[PDB]
Amino acid sequence: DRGIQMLITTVGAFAAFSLMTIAVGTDYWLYSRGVCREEVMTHSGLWRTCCLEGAFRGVCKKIDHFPDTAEYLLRAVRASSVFPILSVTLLFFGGLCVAASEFHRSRHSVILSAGIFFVSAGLSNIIGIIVYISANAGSYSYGWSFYFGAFSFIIAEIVGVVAVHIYIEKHQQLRA
């Protein structure tokens, strides 16, 4: 099953990287009732919150993150969205190592290094979601952007399981 496992990793790495990039870019993370500049039903994201109906529909303004060190650090972290953009960087590198495995089969640590990057991105993504929920709290519904980010985390970890599975199998075959 070495061929299909490698195909599963390649499809997953593309799918995981695409969904995180869509989730960060798409501005439909949370359906809130705020203002665009009276309060109207709006759809929020990581940088901008934009209205869903009314005269100002379609146009909006960058989210002003800034309105005691504990809340200052939390506000700064959620302002820059470092963790979700960090997970995007790790996923992109993970795809590079997966792709580079075919071009250079001499080294064995390449596929394992891909596996660590996929799981490291998942850890980075879950911190961002916890920080995002914590910062936003400090009625609402979650749009398909939030579920796109969460779903990619499941895909990212599943590929990480398959990636190191191949490394163990290939090293087990060589040694024994």
Binding site: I127, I130, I133, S134, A137, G138
Partner: protein, 35 residues
Amino acid sequence: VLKLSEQGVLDKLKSKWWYDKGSALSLSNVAGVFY
């Protein structure tokens, strides 16, 4: 005062100067254990 009340002047002045002026545990409670 009766004229101003019957003509809606007092009502308009009031509306102008007053109105027109204008659970489960949270993740923040357990955010330390997740970090």
